[PDB]
Design a protein around this motif. Structure first.
Motif, short mmCIF file in Angstrom:
data_model
loop_
_atom_site.label_atom_id
_atom_site.label_comp_id
_atom_site.label_asym_id
_atom_site.label_seq_id
_atom_site.Cartn_x
_atom_site.Cartn_y
_atom_site.Cartn_z
N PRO A 137 2.65 -1.61 -0.71
CA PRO A 137 3.56 -1.79 0.14
C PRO A 137 3.55 -3.25 0.61
CG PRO A 137 2.27 0.38 0.55
CD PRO A 137 1.56 -0.39 -0.52
N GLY A 138 2.65 -4.06 0.64
CA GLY A 138 2.68 -5.52 1.15
C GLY A 138 3.45 -6.14 0.09
N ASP A 139 3.23 -5.98 -1.18
CA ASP A 139 3.94 -6.69 -2.12
C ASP A 139 5.33 -6.44 -1.99
OD1 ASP A 139 1.58 -7.75 -3.15
OD2 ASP A 139 1.37 -5.78 -4.40
N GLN B 255 7.11 -5.44 0.60
CA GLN B 255 7.93 -6.23 1.39
C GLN B 255 8.19 -7.65 1.26
OE1 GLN B 255 5.18 -7.08 4.84
NE2 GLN B 255 6.75 -6.65 6.40
N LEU B 256 7.21 -8.35 0.61
CA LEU B 256 7.52 -9.77 0.06
C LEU B 256 8.44 -9.85 -0.82
CD1 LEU B 256 6.50 -12.53 0.15
CD2 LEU B 256 4.52 -11.90 -1.32
N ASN C 282 11.77 -8.89 1.15
CA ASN C 282 12.27 -9.71 2.40
C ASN C 282 12.51 -11.18 2.02
OD1 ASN C 282 11.69 -7.62 4.10
ND2 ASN C 282 10.39 -8.73 5.35
N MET D 118 12.04 -6.13 6.29
CA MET D 118 11.00 -4.97 6.52
C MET D 118 10.03 -5.61 7.24
SD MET D 118 9.09 -3.25 3.38
CE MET D 118 7.18 -3.00 3.30
N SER E 86 0.96 -12.09 0.20
CA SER E 86 0.77 -10.88 0.90
C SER E 86 -0.92 -10.59 0.59
CB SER E 86 1.54 -9.86 0.26
OG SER E 86 0.82 -8.33 0.66
N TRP F 85 -2.92 -4.26 1.85
CA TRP F 85 -2.17 -3.65 1.27
C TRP F 85 -1.16 -3.09 2.06
CZ3 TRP F 85 -2.47 0.32 -3.01
CH2 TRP F 85 -1.77 1.30 -2.89
N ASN F 86 -1.14 -3.25 3.32
CA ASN F 86 -0.29 -2.74 4.18
C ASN F 86 0.92 -4.00 4.50
OD1 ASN F 86 -1.02 -4.58 6.69
ND2 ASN F 86 -2.86 -3.78 5.80
N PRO F 87 2.09 -3.81 5.00
CA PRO F 87 3.26 -4.55 5.00
C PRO F 87 2.84 -5.30 6.38
CG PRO F 87 4.00 -2.69 5.72
CD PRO F 87 2.83 -2.33 5.11
#
Lengths: 534, 534, 49
Positions: free
Chosen positions: A87-89, A91-92, A95, A501, C7, C10-12
């Motif tokens: 998820p984190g990736d 978003q990057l 976005n 996001m 980043s 794991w979370n946005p």
């Protein structure tokens, strides 16, 4: 080479900023794959029939009859966003980038292990697991794409989506030619309609075998296998969306009267009689220049028959569409709360736009003479019935695809979407694929097939129908891939900020595990940021 | 590489005398670490609530509510004096050196072993242990310090303190953001006060994963892992103490009358009327120049609110102090008689000085007019109550920290003290840390994480809530480190000898084992030797 | 001179975006009226220790 590892575990994703707003994304993904002995060491031609279902006048779309060749090989598919980014990736990427390019891809199989299960039938009875130090794991990488292309993402059968959760490959199987007739019918239809599987056409028979068309490697513990680096040949995927429709293309009409005080009812006014305006129209009849009449360059989007099923020699199939919705059913290993019970998939309908979409209810057709207000006899509305059917209008039949159709390609769907897809080997090709945003035209990576080599017992007789009995063996091995993209950093072009996001007080818990360690991966929008289409 | 060792055991400490009273201390420490399969292969977000405890009006300090992410990884912490030096060494360092410099640090993991337990359920029933020659031990060294800094010394969870006693790593876990309100109350407080855990703030959520941010190595028996050499960036730690207080800073008053015969009551006498003396004072009012009035350069030490608990978004917490006492609770593996029974920790309160310490009972405040003997109305004593509370004086509120505050850093606490600590990533930083004498500013060694890779059975299904069943596996491996210091040899500056650590007829048996082989490591003073502060 | 963020979780994370709620704080009106609404600046956690 038993006591020595043959590979490294890496599941990091690196962004290497190059020169001029272009960065290089390196997504590393490695996993522990569990593989069991083949339930059958043979290739089987299996037919699937379900007439009883379709036999129910009105249940045609529920047709499953097909023929498939069941191979004793398993396929290691990693073609799905969820396998490479978290998820984190996402978003990057989503976005801050404005377009993505699929560059290269490579895999490797290391730290192979083969074990054996002994049914210690004592009391309970017990069960024992041992290492077969001399057993081999068979590996085949179909570089020349000899085998049929079977992307596992279409049936949610890719590799897991969590770095810390062992996964498994899927039993490999592919379609075999067959003939089948099924005639439409509704609840009222009288007499039994025609529903029959005719069989196989000799001229389209193709029985594929890995052994016969791909070199196989035998990996023992000490061994390891690595694929080279494949470089794709695909167009760039955009991470921007357009929003204009023919109604928003060009120079708006000059308002001769503008509002003079704030107010939702304070509208501006063109200030000119609809039939005494200047401009261009493609209606040689009227002198009416309206926002729905004025001439536009071409057409953004098109109209196609909806819930149309066509038929060819293998049966009915939905007429595919390029508009804007995919429905993704999956589970546990690819999202769906891990601790979830039962055996009901999780799913979502990724809705993507107003970029080329149509509202049928708004469509209508009139007589060339025009003459408005239009008379009922000179108008076919999405309300007037076709064929007498109360629930069928011309729009369900309608198709406005043509020489002026503008249109965009599929957006990325995290984490369940497929990443790249092989192109059809037809002389004329689809202007796009509905299943993936990247399509390698000439060359696509070859499929990787795994299989536990047969661990025979002292008793084996080739010349006996029997069914070879072999020691219960299974293998665990690590897999590691590297998918490389090239992306461009986005810029701000408007005075206003834009769609991004973010984490809310609402999503918050879709990105963290629970007290039990349950997890899940929620789907996410990909092309969030308007782009001027014209 | 099964039958071959991959490392050497070394637990010797070498003192290499360089040039000019500087020596190089090389403390080698190696140990046998025992590691078990993860109780859960998943990451869990666990909340800890205990309102019932705090619900008891007056039991606020006993607040334990927090949230933590439980990882399936164990952490190999060696950051504690007891891990590198034994009593004999500490005496040497502490007795003959005058300052210590932390120089470099490196570790290595060798002779890895992975075994499997078979529950031979026969009669008793039996139990069997075997070697999994192809199993792997996962290792991760977070060089870039991506993961949260979790020093195990704070919870007495470092590696053992005895070369000849197998040890173990600690389950790794780190804090997760949460909101919580708890309002003070004493026994008499009426009605139920506010005590509530509000939850998690989306904007401070950080779910860390090793797999995703650190490369993992798989070590089989034949394999070995070695860290490079890290060089710290810390100030020198002193092995000398100062004793002067403002009352002992400068030129003592000239005694016009000196004793003329030995005698405890034969005092010297300044010989000048307290208001007719020469000198400097910072009291523009009086003409009184007294040892408590005369002007001193700055202030050695400061005063701070005691048993003050402050509150921020996660709850109450004791207001930390730089004065002089740490309390160390630990056991068995880090001191505490090895044969000791029960499960009650051993502990001590390392008392360190009169270097910057204060006696609140001696503090007092008077009216600017001065005018002594001072009237009760012009004096606030550490006896007069504040807020009406009988047990609260201004000193509990008091803070005399300012532009003139002189002060020293934490001394080393053998063998339970932490050695180095990571600095806060805040724009303004603490002039010191209360937990360690060495603080790497920019770069601190990365944490080393270990974990037994999942040893699956023939039955494994990713798409099932179940709970992966795996062969009972565990690993034993040797660990070896090297911490290097640079120290300066101390010199004698006074005519009188000085404080030295020595063996008495009283400690004697705190440094030898017993008839059963029981052992224990007693704490020891570190900066024993005065140093002129001014 | 600025550094691009990465980043690490794991979370946005927290990101400024346009909502159905701010939408009109970034566009002019029928009269051409305008306004500039204040905004948060350090939105993204950073490990302090």
């Amino acid at each position: 080479g038993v006591g020595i590892s043959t590979g490294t575990f890496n599941n990091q994703t690196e962004f290497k900023f190059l020169e001029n707003g272009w960065v290089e994304i390196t997504a590393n993904s490695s996993r522990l794959v569990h593989l069991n002995m083949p339930e059958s060491e043979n290739y089987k031609r299996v037919v699937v029939n379900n007439m009883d279902k379709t036999a129910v006048k009105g249940n045609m779309a529920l047709d499953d009859i097909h023929v498939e060749i069941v191979t004793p090989w398993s396929l290691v598919d990693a073609n799905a966003w969820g396998v490479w980014f978290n998820p984190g990736d996402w978003q990057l990427i989503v976005n801050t980038m404005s377009e993505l390019h699929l560059v290269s891809f490579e895999q490797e199989i290391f730290n192979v292990v083969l074990k054996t299960v002994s049914e210690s039938a004592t009391q309970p009875p017990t069960k024992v697991y041992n290492n077969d130090l001399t057993a081999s794991l068979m590996v085949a990488l179909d570089s020349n794409n000899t085998m049929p292309f079977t992307p596992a993402a279409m049936r949610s059968e890719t590799l897991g989506f969590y770095p810390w959760k062992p996964t498994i490959p899927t039993p490999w199987r592919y379609y075999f030619q067959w003939d089948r007739t099924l005639i439409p019918s509704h609840t009222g239809t009288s007499g039994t309609p025609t529903n029959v599987y005719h069989g196989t056409d000799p001229d389209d028979v193709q029985f594929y075998t890995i052994e016969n068309s791909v070199p196989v490697h035998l990996l023992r513990t000490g061994d390891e296998f690595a694929t080279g680096t494949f470089f794709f040949d695909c167009k760039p995927c955009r991470l921007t969306h357009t929003w204009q429709t023919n109604r928003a293309l060009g120079l708006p009409p000059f308002l001769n009267s503008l509002p003079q005080s704030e107010g939702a009812t304070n509208f501006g006014d063109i200030g000119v009689q609809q039939d005494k305006r200047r401009g261009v129209t493609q209606m040689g009849n009227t002198d009416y220049i309206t926002e729905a009449t004025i001439m536009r360059p071409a057409e953004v989007g098109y109209s196609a028959p909806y819930y149309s099923f066509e038929a060819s020699t293998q049966g009915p199939f939905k007429t595919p569409i390029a508009a804007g919705d995919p429905r993704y059913a999956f589970g546990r290993q690819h999202g769906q709360k891990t601790t979830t019970t039962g055996e009901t998939p999780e799913r979502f309908t990724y809705i993507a736009h107003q970029d080329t979409g149509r509202y049928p209810e708004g469509d209508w057709i009139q007589n060339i003479n025009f003459n408005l207000p239009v008379t009922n006899d000179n108008v076919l509305l999405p309300t007037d019935p076709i064929g007498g059917k109360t629930g069928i209008n011309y729009t369900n039949i309608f198709n406005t695809y043509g020489p002026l159709t503008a249109l965009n390609n599929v957006p990325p769907v995290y984490p369940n979407g497929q990443i790249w897809d092989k192109e059809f080997d037809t002389d004329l090709k689809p202007r796009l694929h509905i299943n993936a945003p990247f399509v390698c035209q000439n060359n696509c990576p070859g499929q990787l097939f795994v299989k536990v080599a047969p661990n025979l017992t002292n008793q084996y007789d080739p010349d006996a129908s029997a069914n070879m009995s072999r020691i219960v063996t299974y293998s665990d091995f690590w897999w590691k891939g590297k998918l490389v993209f090239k992306a461009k950093l986005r810029a701000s072009h408007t005075w206003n900020p834009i769609q991004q996001m973010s984490i809310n007080v609402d999503n918050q818990f879709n990105y963290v595990p629970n007290n039990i360690g349950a997890m899940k991966i929620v789907y996410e929008k990909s092309q969030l940021a308007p782009r001027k289409l014209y």
